[PDB]
Design an enzyme around this catalytic site. Structure first.
Site, short mmCIF file in Angstrom:
data_model
loop_
_atom_site.label_atom_id
_atom_site.label_comp_id
_atom_site.label_asym_id
_atom_site.label_seq_id
_atom_site.Cartn_x
_atom_site.Cartn_y
_atom_site.Cartn_z
N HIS A 211 0.80 -1.22 0.00
CA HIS A 211 0.00 0.00 0.00
C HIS A 211 0.83 1.28 0.00
O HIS A 211 0.48 2.23 -0.71
CB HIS A 211 -0.96 -0.01 1.19
CG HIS A 211 -2.25 -0.71 0.90
ND1 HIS A 211 -3.10 -1.14 1.90
CD2 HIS A 211 -2.83 -1.05 -0.27
CE1 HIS A 211 -4.15 -1.73 1.35
NE2 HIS A 211 -4.01 -1.68 0.04
N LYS B 51 -14.96 -3.63 -10.68
CA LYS B 51 -14.10 -4.32 -11.63
C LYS B 51 -13.67 -5.68 -11.10
O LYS B 51 -13.75 -6.70 -11.81
CB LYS B 51 -12.88 -3.46 -11.96
CG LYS B 51 -11.86 -4.14 -12.85
CD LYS B 51 -11.46 -3.23 -14.00
CE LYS B 51 -10.37 -3.87 -14.84
NZ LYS B 51 -9.01 -3.58 -14.30
N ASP B 52 -13.23 -5.73 -9.84
CA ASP B 52 -12.83 -7.00 -9.25
C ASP B 52 -14.04 -7.90 -9.00
O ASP B 52 -13.91 -9.12 -8.99
CB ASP B 52 -12.05 -6.77 -7.96
CG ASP B 52 -10.94 -5.75 -8.12
OD1 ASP B 52 -10.78 -5.24 -9.25
OD2 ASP B 52 -10.24 -5.47 -7.13
N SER C 121 0.81 1.15 -6.57
CA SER C 121 0.76 -0.01 -7.44
C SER C 121 1.49 0.32 -8.73
O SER C 121 1.64 1.49 -9.09
CB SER C 121 -0.68 -0.44 -7.73
OG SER C 121 -0.71 -1.52 -8.65
N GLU D 210 -0.06 -33.37 -8.85
CA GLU D 210 -1.05 -32.57 -9.54
C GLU D 210 -0.40 -31.72 -10.62
O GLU D 210 0.83 -31.55 -10.67
CB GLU D 210 -1.81 -31.69 -8.55
CG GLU D 210 -2.92 -32.39 -7.74
CD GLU D 210 -4.09 -32.91 -8.57
OE1 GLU D 210 -3.91 -33.26 -9.76
OE2 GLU D 210 -5.21 -32.96 -8.03
C1 HEM Z 1 -1.54 -15.72 -1.50
C2 HEM Z 1 -1.69 -15.26 -2.74
C3 HEM Z 1 -1.57 -13.82 -3.01
C4 HEM Z 1 -2.47 -12.85 -2.69
C5 HEM Z 1 -3.79 -13.05 -1.99
C6 HEM Z 1 -1.93 -11.62 -3.14
C7 HEM Z 1 -2.61 -10.41 -2.99
C8 HEM Z 1 -2.26 -9.31 -3.74
C9 HEM Z 1 -3.15 -8.29 -4.14
C10 HEM Z 1 -4.61 -8.20 -3.82
C11 HEM Z 1 -2.43 -7.40 -4.88
C12 HEM Z 1 -2.98 -6.15 -5.50
C13 HEM Z 1 -3.58 -6.46 -6.88
C14 HEM Z 1 -2.49 -6.62 -7.90
O1 HEM Z 1 -1.68 -5.69 -8.10
O2 HEM Z 1 -2.39 -7.68 -8.55
C15 HEM Z 1 -1.11 -7.86 -4.94
C16 HEM Z 1 -0.09 -7.22 -5.60
C17 HEM Z 1 1.16 -7.81 -5.75
N1 HEM Z 1 1.55 -9.04 -5.39
FE1 HEM Z 1 0.46 -10.32 -4.57
N2 HEM Z 1 -0.74 -11.82 -3.73
C18 HEM Z 1 -0.45 -13.13 -3.69
C19 HEM Z 1 0.67 -13.81 -4.16
C20 HEM Z 1 1.77 -13.15 -4.69
C21 HEM Z 1 2.90 -13.76 -5.25
C22 HEM Z 1 3.13 -15.25 -5.39
C23 HEM Z 1 3.75 -12.76 -5.65
C24 HEM Z 1 5.06 -12.93 -6.30
C25 HEM Z 1 6.10 -13.40 -5.61
C26 HEM Z 1 3.13 -11.52 -5.33
C27 HEM Z 1 3.66 -10.29 -5.57
C28 HEM Z 1 2.84 -9.18 -5.73
C29 HEM Z 1 3.32 -7.95 -6.36
C30 HEM Z 1 4.70 -7.69 -6.89
C31 HEM Z 1 2.28 -7.10 -6.37
C32 HEM Z 1 2.27 -5.69 -6.91
C33 HEM Z 1 1.57 -5.70 -8.27
C34 HEM Z 1 1.59 -4.32 -8.86
O3 HEM Z 1 1.24 -3.33 -8.17
O4 HEM Z 1 1.94 -4.16 -10.05
N3 HEM Z 1 1.92 -11.80 -4.75
N4 HEM Z 1 -1.02 -9.04 -4.24
#
Ligand code: HEM
Ligand SMILES: CCCCCCCCCCCCCCCCCC(=O)OC[C@H](COP(=O)([O-])OCC(O)COP(=O)([O-])OC[C@@H](COC(=O)CCCCCCCCCCCCCCCCC)OC(=O)CCCCCCCCCCCCCCCCC)OC(=O)CCCCCCCCCCCCCCCCC
Ligand SMILES: CCCCCCCCCCCCCCCCCC(=O)OC[C@H](COP(=O)([O-])OCC(O)COP(=O)([O-])OC[C@@H](COC(=O)CCCCCCCCCCCCCCCCC)OC(=O)CCCCCCCCCCCCCCCCC)OC(=O)CCCCCCCCCCCCCCCCC
Ligand SMILES: COC1=C(OC)C(=O)C(C/C=C(\C)CC/C=C(\C)CC/C=C(\C)CC/C=C(\C)CC/C=C(\C)CC/C=C(\C)CC/C=C(\C)CC/C=C(\C)CC/C=C(\C)CCC=C(C)C)=C(C)C1=O
Ligand SMILES: CCCCCCCCCCCCCCCCCC(=O)OC[C@H](COP(=O)(O)OCCN)OC(=O)CCCCCCCCCCCCCCCCC
Ligand SMILES: CCCCCCCCCCCCCCCCCC(=O)OC[C@H](COP(=O)(O)OCCN)OC(=O)CCCCCCCCCCCCCCCCC
Ligand SMILES: CCCCCCCCCCCCCCCCCC(=O)OC[C@H](COP(=O)(O)OCCN)OC(=O)CCCCCCCCCCCCCCCCC
Ligand code: HEC
Ligand code: HEM
Ligand code: HEM
Ligand code: HEM
Ligand code: FES
Lengths: 239, 379, 52, 56, 74, 164, 379, 54
Positions: B201, B227-228, B205, B271
């Site tokens: 946060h 959207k989501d 983003s 799997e």
């Molecule tokens: C348990 C599963 C996960 C949840 C619930 C989660 C949740 C979120 C959410 C809600 C966002 C904001 C929406 C978005 O930008 O896509 C986010 C952003 C992000 N997540 Fe995750 N995430 C998860 C797994 C991961 C994994 C595996 C990675 C990579 C190692 C990761 C890295 C990031 C990054 C880098 C962002 C920033 C995206 C951006 O602002 O461009 N997350 N995460």
């Protein structure tokens, strides 16, 4: 070596929203109880399950009453006989796995409660295995007491030919054709390993129409709310 | 007197995390896969609890309990198959999310990236634990192989496999401890996801262009909530199709056979979402080398911020790198397919080349290509 | 409290908000009957009693 | 316009909006269930258990 | 990071219209189809080749497996 | 505004239908399964049970005696008083139809099974610690604290009497 | 350059929580129990996990599995008795914490007080549910009685007991659903405890005097860490004394017997921390009124912020209120003792009278005493 | 067939009666309680059981 991939038969339930033939389900339970039940077990599927899908209530009650199942301790603690009821599960062949293996040469007849959902091919595989017994070709002479089934992995199965023409008299009046018997038992097994097929396809229909309505409307709401952003005329007036 | 939305303690956190959070104005659908993941957690946790209310973890009756769930409980099959295909969709969305993060340069957020890697490890272990619980042939034998894989560790290795695996073989104790860990872990995943958002946060983003979007931030609630919501409804579409027309499409039929330690199934595969590592395990002949390569296949994610040499955070304006990224994706699908297939002549060499190409793209080809493009753009 | 809510303008607010709150109550009652499939009420309504 | 009457009567108040939504659910659940079931039985005529009890 | 300490901007004017006055789908197909075709033309040149080479690799591997699993005359 | 909000209203009613048709699935899932419904709460007995007999069956988790109380034993039960009984329960509330008595088969003292046609009064006798029982289903006295439990049986179609 | 302690988000939250949080200097030991509860939470949860690793929820294995944990599992008896006596100590600390909140006017923090009431409800539900898991005679029979108490609810009530039981009575389905809910609930307790701490941290704790201590505040880390360490050590002293010398002290011996539904136990009684509200239930003759009194006996805590009328928040300067509070404590002890005893003469009359005196003191004597208190001090 | 073999360290203590109903029918209908947890189940402990036997 190799292995026959079971050809995709045109099953009545193969359709995306097509159900099982419940009359075929009843006629396939009949063949199970007549020839299959003598050596195979169905465990989980009980006499109660048959009510409302293939048999009516009193027919299933009579069906369970026909067979005698073993009930718990007697007043003296003796493990006694008793007519079956709806609550009872499908009676099983030779009690422990060792007796079943010993009686049937050295092979264990697998339970059919999941056999159509545990084998790669399902109904096609089962139907081909039953109606696929062929005389062994040259140079591949198998044991004594063994039978050549090309669709069986290893091409050497331990079944006395289960379904031969004119083995069971169907109550409905359908001829006892080997293909008819095999198709009926295969449909019965498909119901057995999938006792939600009808209701699953019903839910599929309901969900398909529900979200065929929902997607356009939710998308319209999204575009309605986002429309301010997607029509922002910008400007730049530096001094 | 004052607005409760921005004055109440919990409501302040909710407001500045989801309602009035300034989000970039032009995030594509790829970002939506974030929210789906969280939903794919809750949607799958609620189902997962309801199986725990009819599933006995004893080895002698675990499979019969699962069959009773699918056959006797009111609408039990819905819950069971929703759980399985929800795990499958969770992994689909996780792979898409990691692809988005790697692509649009979000891995430059550091703390969020490492926390995401830890989340990936936790959920990827949780699914492996969950697969064992039905106690099918593939469940038992895949658990045996994957746990015995740990024996390659020098010295203490076997002892560790003596401890995690309960000694003996995969037996009564193993099922119970796998169930207990399967139950505890997703709450740790929830806490780590909260920490993930907390780290995300204050940075905002990453928009698709990769440029700072501080001049175009828009409130979250009016737009991105709906959207989501639409994205989650599409994920509902795919999940319900899977659960309701081909429930066992992404599954091995032999799992519907009670586990028997006296018969190895003809094929031993995990799997579909694990094969991309499983094939890597088969790439290196050495057992310990296989362990190291399999672990590094996921550990390489935290090295991505260090291996960023391009002057542009994003990937939209880097076509040569785009070809490399899509080659990487194709290599991932190739590795999955190779892991699906057994170990004969046509597959050994393809798997070896696929793993080598995977690593060579991540550590070698991508930074060099980024430097080449920096030179080609006069900077 | 007791006396501080016992005022003329407060009963004016009560009169103003009686319709909206009262038929919010009807909204809730209809939603409860709907969600629970209350056969005691749903039997009398037409075209829905056929579901039973 | 009929839509104008709809907004003026049933949609201006959010509470009567909720009432309209609730009654719409009341009628729509039964309508959808009946229609979908009718379609399902029409596709699989002579195959479901409902179409065969007549013999037994 | 809340609204107000985000950035400094000058001489920028944004015109926006009410969502109840714009149609939610302004020229949906007649304008979307050319744009989607343009996006496909832009991206396919770098997206398709790596996925298609996977297809030839898959077909080659399958036929290699089936021909190696077959018997040879000897 | 009417059209733009009609879109929202139709979306909302669809979502409400889906939400009910999911939460109801879950709630009914936590409810009683089919096996307990079709194994426990079905106790049809045919009138083959003749006069003066106590063929007992192990239903739910306890045995139950289907007594064919003949006219004789009926009038002994009628003659036996109510007040000096440990927990006064008149035969009227004990049993609906005099010819047949439905009651559980676990003596309340510590359990076991009371053998029939014994226990001085005549009806039942638990031999574990020698507790004799009233023939109507009560207990006149003995180690057992209170009377034998009577289930929620139903006497419909006397030929086929169901126990709940 | 800035402090990692108060610039890193996680470390900043921890710092503002229990490192540099201002605290009253004159905080007595009565507040230490708060931290003790958290300790008694974690020491519970971890132990529970290990128990869940050797427990097979089924009416054919529950007692056998618990016995296997006690005897065969390496150091399993210590975990089992640690768990039981830790639940008992958790309730001791909870009751002492509620007493402290009542005494020093800590219910003036309305949000924290309500969240604490919710936590207390959840803890009672968790313990009641968990006591079923060993599936002893007392477990099953008490569960039957407590769940059947819901039959008194009008209309839907009967159906509810069929819903909770998963059938016609307490059986295997009830056991496994109780196991699943017993697993999930403590994490809800953890989240609610985090919210409770947030609400309290907004305003700060209350000193025994009741006067605001803003002028004299000390940092939390240098002092109120080691004091809480000493408190937790004392709690461990008591808890391991119970576990290692009198393991089955508070627990009824009848639990160490297979649950036979053919034999009612001599006396059906809940835990010592449940006997007071169960005695309140016993006191009222009407069944529905009994359940209403039972739920009100705990729900009355929410009314306490409204019933305060004395101008002094705390009780250090209200001796009459102190005597009333100690009368209330003795009344609760009497309720527990009566609940232990059977409903016979004279226990019936004693239980009834003490039940009336409970509500009479809370609702009537305390406010009237507060009015006399204010009148006695010129104000 | 269920074959009989000499007991070993793995086996638990032999059960004198095959099934509980056999035990009750054998003695008088009463069930001899399991002696594994008998002391920890009766209020009084060993002092109870001893007092019973003497
Ligand atoms: C348990 C599963 C996960 C949840 C619930 C989660 C949740 C979120 C959410 C809600 C966002 C904001 C929406 C978005 O930008 O896509 C986010 C952003 C992000 N997540 Fe995750 N995430 C998860 C797994 C991961 C994994 C595996 C990675 C990579 C190692 C990761 C890295 C990031 C990054 C880098 C962002 C920033 C995206 C951006 O602002 O461009 N997350 N995460
Ligand atoms: C016709 C030509 C073939 C199909 C289109 C793909 C292609 O050739 O070029 C893609 C072409 C070029 O990519 P781009 O639009 O420049 O950049 C990526 C989009 O911004 C990414 O998409 P977007 O965020 O601009 O818009 C969402 C888009 C695509 O949505 C997604 O890609 C995410 C959801 C689906 C993920 C799984 C499937 C991929 O949705 C659709 O295209 C249809 C609805 C799919 C369900 C989700 C709503 O884009 C499109 O045709 C539309 C988006 C991609 C569709 C696939
Ligand atoms: C994992 C599970 C699967 C994935 C779950 C969903 C993830 C993504 C969710 C994205 C989402 O909900 O909305 C964004 C996503 C992007 O579309 P958009 O929000 O209208 O923004 C389009 C851009 O402004 C770009 O607009 P444009 O320049 O392409 O022209 C305007 C417009 C018009 O062009 C078209 O509609 C394309 C022509 C064929 C129709 O474009 C579109 O509608 C593109 C999508 C066409 C489908 O929504 C869709 O792709 C709509 C799906 C199809 C309609 C609803 C179902 C019927
Ligand atoms: C920049 O983009 C962003 C989004 O979407 C594009 C988002 O959805 C969200 C909001 C996301 C959610 C409310 C859910 C998805 C993921 C999370 C990590 C949120 C926390 C976790 C859960 C809701 C699931 C577990 C909780 C319970 C069981 C945020 C904050 C966001 O920042
Ligand atoms: C995974 C989060 C976003 C919402 C934050 C909370 C807002 C709030 O408290 O709304 C309830 C509101 C409170 O009052 P509000 O209208 O906000 O005015 C405050 C003036 N100082 O409440 C009111 O104004 C009146 C009380 C509520 C009335 C509800 C009526 C409909 C009930 C159905
Ligand atoms: C099949 C996978 C792709 C599906 C969507 C269609 C596609 O190829 O999209 C390519 C799209 C190009 O658009 P953009 O990233 O803006 O770059 C434009 C440069 N002129 O770029 C993207 O869509 C990039 C998305 C990256 C993350 C998702 C794809 C990988 C998922 C597995 C890892
Ligand atoms: C505990 C026994 C010791 C005890 O209470 O000692 C008295 C002590 C005095 O406290 P203080 O505030 O210094 O009194 C000033 C009087 N002029 O302390 C008190 O008077 C206050 C003690 C009660 C407040 C803390 C709660 C401790 C647990 C009491 C039992 C709770 C039982 C459940 C109640 C619901
Ligand atoms: C009198 C004996 C006998 C009869 C009759 C019989 N079976 Fe079997 N069956 C066996 C034995 C023995 C095996 C074990 C062979 C093996 O190892 O695959 C077997 C194996 C099977 C298998 C497992 C094949 C596999 O893929 O491994 C299926 C499916 C099967 N039977 C179905 C049927 C059906 C359907 C019928 C009749 C409608 C039937 N059987 C009748 C004895 C019998
Ligand atoms: C990280 C999230 C989780 C994933 C990815 C996951 C995945 C899985 C999978 C794939 C299975 C096997 C299903 C099958 O073979 O049909 C499984 C089993 C199971 N999981 Fe989970 N699980 C998760 C979390 C949970 C949670 C939170 C619970 C409890 C609330 C739970 C309870 C169960 C139970 C009881 C089983 C055995 C019954 C069954 O096989 O469906 N899981 N899990
Ligand atoms: C809020 C904290 C907790 C409380 C108050 C609590 C309470 C209890 C109680 C009173 C028992 C019965 C003890 C006995 O047999 O005498 C019990 C048993 C059990 N609890 Fe918990 N519990 C808690 C946390 C947990 C957690 C988090 C888990 C899961 C990880 C768990 C798993 C179990 C299991 C498996 C049993 C059965 C074993 C046994 O009875 O000894 N508990 N619990
Ligand atoms: C889950 C168990 C609980 C935990 C972990 C917990 C945690 C805490 C902690 C650590 C404190 C600060 C130390 C203290 O003041 O004692 C606190 C304060 C407080 N808690 Fe709790 N609490 C719990 C249960 C309760 C209950 C049942 C209530 C009463 C309904 C309650 C009401 C309060 C109040 C009023 C305070 C403020 C006391 C003061 O400032 O002097 N809590 N809580
Ligand atoms: S159990 Fe019937 S007399 Fe003791």
């Amino acid at each position: 070596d190799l292995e026959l991939h079971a050809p995709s038969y045109p099953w009545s339930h193969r359709g995306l929203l097509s159900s099982l033939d419940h009359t075929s389900i009843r006629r396939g339970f009949q063949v199970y109880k007549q020839v299959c039940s003598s050596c195979h077990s169905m465990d989980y599927v009980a006499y109660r399950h048959l009510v409302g899908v293939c048999y009516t209530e009193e027919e299933a009650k009579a069906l369970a009453e026909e067979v005698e199942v073993q009930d718990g301790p007697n007043e003296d603690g003796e493990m006694f006989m008793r007519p079956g009821k709806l609550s009872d599960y499908f009676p099983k062949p030779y009690p422990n796995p060792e007796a079943a293996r010993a009686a049937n040469n050295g092979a264990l007849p697998p339970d059919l409660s999941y056999i159509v959902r545990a084998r790669h091919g399902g109904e096609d595989y089962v139907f081909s295995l039953l109606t696929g017994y062929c005389e062994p070709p040259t140079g591949v002479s198998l044991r004594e007491g063994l039978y050549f089934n090309p669709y069986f992995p290893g091409q050497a199965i331990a079944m006395a030919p289960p379904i031969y023409n004119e083995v069971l008299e169907f109550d409905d009046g359908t001829p006892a054709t080997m293909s008819q018997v095999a198709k009926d038992v295969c449909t019965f097994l498909r119901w057995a390993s999938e006792p939600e097929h009808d209701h699953r396809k019903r839910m599929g229909l309901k969900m398909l129409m529900m979200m065929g309505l929902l997607l356009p409307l939710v998308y319209a709401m999204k575009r309605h709310k986002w429309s301010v952003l997607k029509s922002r005329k910008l400007a730049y007036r530096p001094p | 007197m004052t607005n409760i939305r921005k004055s109440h303690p919990l409501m302040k956190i909710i407001n500045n995390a989801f309602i009035d959070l300034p989000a970039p104005s032009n995030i594509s659908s790829w970002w939506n896969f974030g929210s789906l993941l969280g939903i794919c957690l809750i949607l799958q946790i609620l189902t997962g609890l309801f199986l725990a209310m009819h599933y006995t973890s004893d080895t002698t009756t675990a499979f019969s309990s699962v069959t009773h769930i699918c056959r006797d409980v009111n609408y039990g099959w819905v819950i069971r198959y929703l759980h399985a295909n929800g795990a499958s969709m969770f992994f689909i969305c996780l792979f898409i999310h990691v692809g988005r993060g790697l692509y649009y340069g979000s891995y430059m957020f550091l703390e969020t990236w490492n926390i995401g890697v830890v989340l990936l490890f936790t959920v990827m272990a949780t699914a492996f634990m969950g697969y064992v619980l039905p106690w099918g042939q593939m469940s038992f034998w895949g658990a045996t192989v994957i746990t015995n894989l740990l024996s390659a560790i020098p010295y203490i290795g076997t002892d560790l496999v003596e401890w995690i695996w309960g000694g003996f073989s995969v037996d009564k104790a193993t099922l119970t401890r796998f169930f207990a860990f399967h139950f505890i872990l997703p709450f740790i995943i929830t806490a780590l996801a909260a920490v993930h958002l907390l780290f995300l946060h204050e940075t905002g983003s990453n928009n698709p262009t990769g440029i700072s979007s501080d001049m175009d931030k828009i409130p979250f609630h009016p737009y991105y909530t709906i959207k989501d919501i639409l994205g989650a409804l599409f994920m509902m579409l795919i999940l319900l199709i899977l659960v309701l027309f081909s429930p066992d499409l992404l599954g091995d039929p032999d799992n519907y056979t009670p586990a028997n330690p006296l018969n190895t199934p003809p094929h031993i595969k995990p799997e579909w979402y694990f094969l991309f590592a499983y094939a890597i395990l088969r790439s290196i002949p050495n057992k310990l080398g296989g362990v190291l390569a399999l672990v590094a296949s996921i550990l390489i994610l935290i090295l991505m911020p260090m291996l960023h040499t391009s002057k542009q955070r994003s990937m939209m304006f880097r076509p040569l790198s785009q070809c490399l990224f899509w080659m990487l994706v194709a290599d991932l699908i190739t590795l999955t397919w190779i892991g699906g297939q057994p170990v004969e002549h046509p597959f050994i060499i393809i798997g070896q080349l696929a793993s080598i190409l995977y690593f060579l793209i991540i550590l070698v080809l991508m930074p060099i290509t980024s430097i080449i493009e920096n030179n080609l753009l006069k900077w | 409290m007791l006396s501080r809510f016992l005022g003329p303008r407060y009963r004016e607010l009560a009169r103003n908000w009686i319709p909206t709150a009262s038929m919010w109550g009807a909204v809730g009652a209809v939603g409860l009957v709907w969600a629970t499939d209350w056969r005691l009420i749903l039997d009398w309504v037409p075209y829905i009693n056929g579901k039973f | 316009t009929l839509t104008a009457r709809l907004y003026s009567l049933l949609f201006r108040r959010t509470s009567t909006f909720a009432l309209t939504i609730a009654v719409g659910a009341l009628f729509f659940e039964r309508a959808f269930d009946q229609g979908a079931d009718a379609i399902y039985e029409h596709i699989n005529q002579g195959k479901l258990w409902k179409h065969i009890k007549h013999k037994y | 990071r809340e609204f107000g300490h985000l950035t400094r901007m000058r001489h920028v004017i944004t015109y926006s219209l009410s969502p109840f006055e714009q149609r939610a789908f302004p020229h949906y197909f007649t304008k979307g189809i050319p744009n989607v075709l343009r996006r496909t033309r832009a991206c396919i040149l770098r997206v398709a080749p790596p996925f298609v080479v996977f297809y030839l690799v898959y077909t080659w591997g399958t036929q290699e497996f089936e021909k190696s699993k077959r018997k040879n005359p000897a | 505004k009417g059209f733009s909000y009609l879109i929202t209203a139709t979306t909302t009613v669809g979502v409400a239908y889906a939400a009910k048709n999911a939460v109801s699935q879950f709630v009914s899932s936590m409810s009683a399964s089919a096996d307990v419904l079709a194994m426990s709460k079905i106790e049809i007995k045919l009138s083959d049970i003749p006069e003066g007999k106590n063929m007992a069956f192990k239903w739910r988790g306890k045995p139950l005696f289907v007594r064919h109380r003949t006219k004789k034993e009926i009038d002994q039960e009628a003659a036996v008083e109510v007040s000096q009984l440990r927990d006064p329960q008149h035969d009227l509330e004990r049993v609906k139809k005099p010819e047949w008595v439905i009651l559980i088969g676990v003596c309340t003292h510590l359990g076991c099974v009371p053998i029939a046609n014994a226990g001085d009064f005549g009806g039942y006798y638990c031999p574990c610690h020698g507790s004799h029982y009233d023939a109507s289903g009560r207990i006149r006295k003995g180690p057992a604290p209170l009377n034998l439990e009577v289930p929620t049986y139903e006497f419909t179609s006397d030929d086929l009497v169901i126990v709940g």
